[PDB]
């Protein structure tokens with residue numbers, strides 16, 4: 001009976017540092033959707049755990065030259081952590097090297113603009129140059145554009161891969177800050193979950209425009225063949241059926257909304 | 261062993277699997293059309309197998325009898341070795357997951373409310389509070405079970421009503437429920453998955469609609485018998501087809517491109 005090392009990532013409102021965190025220790029420093037979900041998963045599977053924030057601050061991508069994985073994915077693949085409880089997107093390239101539970105949350109890539117920016121769709125972003133746009137580094141959104149053979153998205157990638165200065169950001173907070181200070185000349189492509197949360201926070205100057213560009217899910221990840229996987233998957237399905245996932249989403253998005 | 265034809269269990273449920281107009285003069289898989297017919301072809305291509313579509317004998321999705329403990333429906337067909345895979349609008353649930361394997365979901369849905377247009381109902385809450393408008397579910401599936409197991413006040417209360425209502429508010433098929441919404445002049449509302457509600461909303465005579473939010477959020481998965489050698493490849497195939505755009509193209513094809521109500 002070992003303490004399970006949980007890798008996760010600081011990403012609002014999934015895992016955030018509490019306001020008084022420097023006077024707090026271990027798991028108690030953090031709050032958020034995935035902090036509550038970790039507690040619930042651990043209860044139903046019956047383990048003790050330690051939240052650890054991923055060292056390199058990344059979700060996970062595979063370097064094309066070395067084939068080495070970074071981020072939470074790489075922590076699971078190289079045996080640093082036992083489980084990933086995070087907004088980690090289920091993808092085919094990841095599923096090849098790690099296991100995922102059934103999804104605990106739905107999402108899709110979406111567009112974030114500063115309010116009043118004259119963009120309504122991906123198609124709109126793609127037909128112009130005045131408004132720059134990009135995605136997070138080392139995540140599933142960047143890859144979706146990398147891999148897309150849909151004309152509008154292919155054309156969006158061609159611009160993004162070569163744009164100068166770089167349109168890509170290391171963190172969601174960086175991308176969001178860029179939107180907010182670019183006076184409508186930078187739009188950010190990010191997952192609808194993160195977009196809708198931000199929209200409901202002060203200074204209330206961003207919005208999600210248009211529909212989602214895809215539809216997919218976050219799952220709880222474990223190293224390939226790990227013994228936790230079966231229990232974690234049953235636990236996710238249980239929490240889904242009890243209504244707890246829905247309770248948590250409302251708690252962290254809509255109950256803590258501050259743009260009325 | 262040498263490669264066997266994969267027996268696929270599915271269910272006649274529009275627009276997932278339907279009989280082609282001219283089915284009597286065709287053979288085998290060519291008799292059927294729809295979303296799950298198209299999806300089966302693709303899953304099979306990408307996993308490298310031959311398959312035979314078969315409609316489940318009892319016309320049911322799958323539930324376990326409380327007394328006999330026997331699983332019926334598509335789930336029965338996989339549990340008892342009569343099929344190798346189910347490709348259908350079969351909901352991923354915990355009880356099912358304990359006896360069969362599911363791929364990651366291929367399509368997202370939630371329980372929702374179907375009314376005849378002009379029915380004075382806007383929510384589950386509305387339905388729970390009142391009595392002139394009867395409501396029920398498909399008599400053997402994930403939706404009925406959702407209500408039988410829910411701890412949420414409005415839904416417990418809905419169940420308490422539905423289980424004891426007479427005449428029965430439960431129906432044998434989705435088509436029966438829709439026919440009942442349509443014939444009951446606003447006095448019956450039907451609780452069914454959003455996907456099916458959304459489809460019917462786009463069909464002549466265009467007299468129904470989905471109202472309110474969805475009551476839950478889940479998915480349909482491709483099912484295999486627990487531990488089957490297909491599970492892995494089918495799962496990777498679902499993910500590839502999601503990431504390429506195929507699932508979205510198929511939903512658009514079968515729901516919206518062929519809609520009859522604008």
Ligand SMILES: O=C(c1ccc(-n2nc(C(F)(F)F)c3c2CCCC3)cc1)N1CCCC1
Pocket residue numbers: 090091103104105106107215216217218240245364365366367368369477478479499502507
């Ligand atoms: O409401 C959902 C839900 C259901 C299904 C999905 N997922 N997840 C995936 C994928 F596995 F990521 F690819 C796909 C879908 C639907 C679209 C096809 C691919 C996403 C979210 N839940 C909330 C709690 C349980 C699942």
Ligand SMILES: N[C@@H](CCC(=O)O)C(=O)O
Pocket residue numbers: 059060087088089090136138139140141142189190191
């Ligand atoms: N959820 C993403 C990170 C955010 C994004 O890529 O937009 C991932 O698992 O890689």
Ligand SMILES: N[C@@H](CCC(=O)O)C(=O)O
Pocket residue numbers: 321322349350351352398400401402403404451452453
């Ligand atoms: N998709 C459901 C059947 C339809 C319903 O229950 O509303 C099942 O797998 O049981």
Ligand SMILES: [Zn+2]
Pocket residue numbers: 040244
């Ligand atoms: Zn619990």
Ligand SMILES: [Zn+2]
Pocket residue numbers: 063064065066
């Ligand atoms: Zn490199």
